[PDB]
Amino acid sequence: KTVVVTTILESPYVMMKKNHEMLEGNERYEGYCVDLAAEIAKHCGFKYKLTIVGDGKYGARDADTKIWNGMVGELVYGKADIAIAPLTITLVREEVIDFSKPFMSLGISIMIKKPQKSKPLTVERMVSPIESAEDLSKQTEIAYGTLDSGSTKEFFRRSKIAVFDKMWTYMRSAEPSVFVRTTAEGVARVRKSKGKYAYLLESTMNEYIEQRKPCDTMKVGGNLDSKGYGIATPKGSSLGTPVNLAVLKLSEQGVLDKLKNKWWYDKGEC
Amino acid sequence: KTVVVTTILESPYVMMKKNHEMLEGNERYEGYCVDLAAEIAKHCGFKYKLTIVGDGKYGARDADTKIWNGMVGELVYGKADIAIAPLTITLVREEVIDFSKPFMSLGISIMIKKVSPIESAEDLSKQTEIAYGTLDSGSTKEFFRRSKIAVFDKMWTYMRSAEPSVFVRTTAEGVARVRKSKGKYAYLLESTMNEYIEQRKPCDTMKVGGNLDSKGYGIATPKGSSLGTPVNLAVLKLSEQGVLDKLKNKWWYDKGECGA
Amino acid sequence: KTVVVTTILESPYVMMKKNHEMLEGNERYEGYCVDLAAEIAKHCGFKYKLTIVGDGKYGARDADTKIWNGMVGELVYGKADIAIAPLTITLVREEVIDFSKPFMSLGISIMIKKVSPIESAEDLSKQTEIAYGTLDSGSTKEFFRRSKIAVFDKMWTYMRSAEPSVFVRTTAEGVARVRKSKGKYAYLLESTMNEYIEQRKPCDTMKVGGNLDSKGYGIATPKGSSLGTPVNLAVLKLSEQGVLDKLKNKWWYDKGECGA
Amino acid sequence: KTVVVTTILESPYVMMKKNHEMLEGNERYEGYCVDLAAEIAKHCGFKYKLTIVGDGKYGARDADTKIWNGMVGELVYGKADIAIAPLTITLVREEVIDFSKPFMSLGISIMIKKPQKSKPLTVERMVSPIESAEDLSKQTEIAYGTLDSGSTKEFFRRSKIAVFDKMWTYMRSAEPSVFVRTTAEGVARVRKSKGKYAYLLESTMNEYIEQRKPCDTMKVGGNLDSKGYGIATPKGSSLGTPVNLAVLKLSEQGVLDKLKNKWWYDKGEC
């Protein structure tokens, strides 16, 4: 019996290859998630096909409807079997699906456009207007937003920290909307914002995007928290413990670190 | 009914206070693990009793007899219900106990005394004039033993063919041996202990290089226990509330008895 | 009986003199290969006639038809007896022809125009803004195609998925393309040609990095020929006498039409 | 049928392991030659046992006796089947045994003791009394010699170059004898010579010894010639072409370069 794997187009997790027009099946995609699923299938023998969520979201319980979307809705309603994708482990998601041990560390970081270096011994020094998340809430000339139906958005909604509460209040009272539908949307806004907009996203994607052409963005401050990416599993399923042990074995053998170095640091010329 | 908790005496995880001789009850202990246990009890709503394992030991499988001794042995044999202690998550333990979600990330680090001409672990393995070891019955020695990378295999071969006994009984004895060796003994230990040690008196040790792998600490429960899901939910809730970060800052960086 | 020799017109291996229109016979050719052929004939004691292959081609197996074309084809089909030319030694050719002992060591090198921010071949593969190719029907393209190292596999994939045609017919055309590209075309060629080119006019190209592998040039003979052992002995004798080094110095470093 | 492999104790080609007392068979030795023979056996299936020549020599036709010694005598007389060892390909040896294509490049280099650096902007510069082989024959205060029953000795005997002829004449007219029986003997003479003696040996062993403790020797000048190490085979044997293709395949696949980097550059701290 073929199980279905749900994944989102994200770099460098899943990429459409240049010769994907004549290729059909699992050979269309390349990146971290595809070979991670390959290693999962090697460890526990099964046949799998990669699928993309219809709305391309991560998952969030809509207010006053109690309906899950994204990859969470793929697995809760029973139309999916496993989600090998950068899905963040949260409290709300664990109560509806089973999460394996995290296979990747992450954190909430800030994206800003790289400032122009000041020429005037003759050393080049870079100055930036944002150094952490403390002053980001204080200043109002720079607007900040998050990704809709993501872990960061919900985390900001249910955060009782004073600075995080102020950030959430500003996001609620922001016009026009500072939220974005995809990671590429926020990155494009950062690009064509001329330093007027800052994007809140995971540290791994931020680091990857910073080190790719045209190489004009940089990450400021530290991670706002510590979380991780896990493999989702529907509640009361038989794949939970097998994928958990598979993730543990892959982490122990160092395959995850090798894939990390291959898919983030090899092609990081600037 | 009361619930027994097994914890290893490790800093900054559990202190036996400072005037413990005149203290009776649950106030004789303090630390990150004590606070975490209190918060877990508050969330779940059960009476908990903090106890120390009879033999100070994190827990590992014995030699060709399938006996668990230490803190994991205290749980797998039914004498303990929960263990709020810095227990590393690894594949072999998951087969015998239930791990909650990790609450402190970490990795394998190297601590020496005062440019540090040692770079990463690549140079450490090929440099033989300096001795280095791990902690008895932990997770680092198991990771080195069962690794398949060639350089990690070289470290494991150096571990097994080492004279005299390079292994240390406790982390405190390991850092004491580092102090008394005066730059001739590196210690392969996890990160959190390294930041805690390097930020206290006399502040003569520091972490060098990066981390060889990424692991974390979990809450161990007996297989098929009724508290695994509640403790997982409590850990996730505390992580969402930022309480874990608050306690980490309080017991690691708040004091800072050195130049930071 | 006369012996026919097949040689590809390559410098500094074989010149067609300078006033070749008024030259008839064996004096119309000069170079390292001509001198080597003369010395082989002197040692063995046979009449040799220097000829150029009809189609300028080092020789490689054709596509799914098992036909050898070029200099190796000139030998395997019985029309040639010996070939004193810079033919690289590889496994596939050894199955069809007999190679003498190598007389000039070499390796795969990279030649660009005038700090050279390219380092080794590791940076060349991951840098895509600059085009690079090999020589048609040689040995470098075969080595890249049949390699199993991942980075060499990346170079081979770039070779096959390249627009426009990056391959060049002759080495002279390759260096001319390097000249006309003005720092936007690296050439993957063997060493000896690289030192010979970089030391002549206009002296605007240089070798960068190291050598990806080590190979050599041999004397090819038909399978089961009566001259393989004599030519091997002659090559070894010339190597012992230092004559090979003398001719290498004469045709590579003696002239030196640049700043050395 | 088990064939016999003859090899000489040479570093880093063959080393006796520290735990060689309780180990018997092919597990006693470690280095380049042992794993090269392992790869040879993997490529062409056969069972092999490693053996050491009785007199520990390389091979030279004794004058007025026409008797071969070393590994050449192991194979010519029929008491050996293959010689996977650093045996140099020469004209005289090819006429008595079959040689495969070279698997390692080499050259004749000079060993001298590393001179003391002169302190008196405050840069440390090293000066040496020998810069090439041209002035080595001219000066007489520094004595030079070679290894007996080696390729270098015979090459100097049958060299018609003026400088090489002068070097051979000096070696013939040297008292006490400047020749050595083993590589370790010449290295020890260089060590306890205080710059009074120079050793002529292959470039690979010279480079390896220079980069090991106590790291007090250095190689001067360039290689006097270009030669190579091959795999010997008795005349008219059936292993010739198989080992030739095996060497070609191993060279093509890059196993030789990997073994080189493992056995010369990994443990080269100084």
Ligand SMILES: NS(=O)(=O)c1cc2c(cc1Cl)N[C@H]([C@H]1C[C@H]3C=C[C@@H]1C3)NS2(=O)=O
């Ligand atoms: N900053 S830290 O090392 O004290 C730390 C580290 C971690 C924390 C919380 C803290 Cl405070 N929670 C995460 C957990 C939360 C959810 C996402 C990953 C696991 C499940 N694990 S972690 O990434 O190992």
Ligand SMILES: NS(=O)(=O)c1cc2c(cc1Cl)N[C@H]([C@H]1C[C@H]3C=C[C@@H]1C3)NS2(=O)=O
């Ligand atoms: N270096 S990294 O971010 O790619 C990374 C991150 C992590 C890895 C492994 C790697 Cl390679 N494994 C751990 C897992 C291993 C065992 C201990 C914690 C979980 C269960 N999770 S993690 O701390 O999220």
Ligand SMILES: NS(=O)(=O)c1cc2c(cc1Cl)N[C@H]([C@H]1C[C@H]3C=C[C@@H]1C3)NS2(=O)=O
């Ligand atoms: N210096 S050079 O590149 O012109 C050069 C290179 C080589 C020469 C001779 C010269 Cl002059 N002979 C050797 C041969 C001699 C004997 C030892 C190795 C082969 C058989 N091959 S080589 O190492 O490829």
Ligand SMILES: NS(=O)(=O)c1cc2c(cc1Cl)N[C@H]([C@H]1C[C@H]3C=C[C@@H]1C3)NS2(=O)=O
């Ligand atoms: N870099 S090295 O000295 O270990 C080295 C030296 C040599 C290698 C391979 C290596 Cl890795 N292969 C060549 C062989 C390959 C084919 C071409 C020449 C012989 C037959 N001989 S070599 O030029 O003597």
Ligand SMILES: N[C@@H](CCC(=O)O)C(=O)O
């Ligand atoms: N990685 C996030 C989505 C992207 C974001 O919110 O920045 C998640 O799993 O929810």
Ligand SMILES: N[C@@H](CCC(=O)O)C(=O)O
């Ligand atoms: N802390 C580890 C022991 C290994 C170490 O600390 O080095 C454990 O809980 O198993």
Ligand SMILES: N[C@@H](CCC(=O)O)C(=O)O
């Ligand atoms: N010189 C090689 C051709 C490849 C090259 O020169 O790049 C040969 O003789 O086969």
Ligand SMILES: N[C@@H](CCC(=O)O)C(=O)O
């Ligand atoms: N490698 C040499 C022996 C050592 C030497 O002569 O320096 C040979 O094969 O003859």
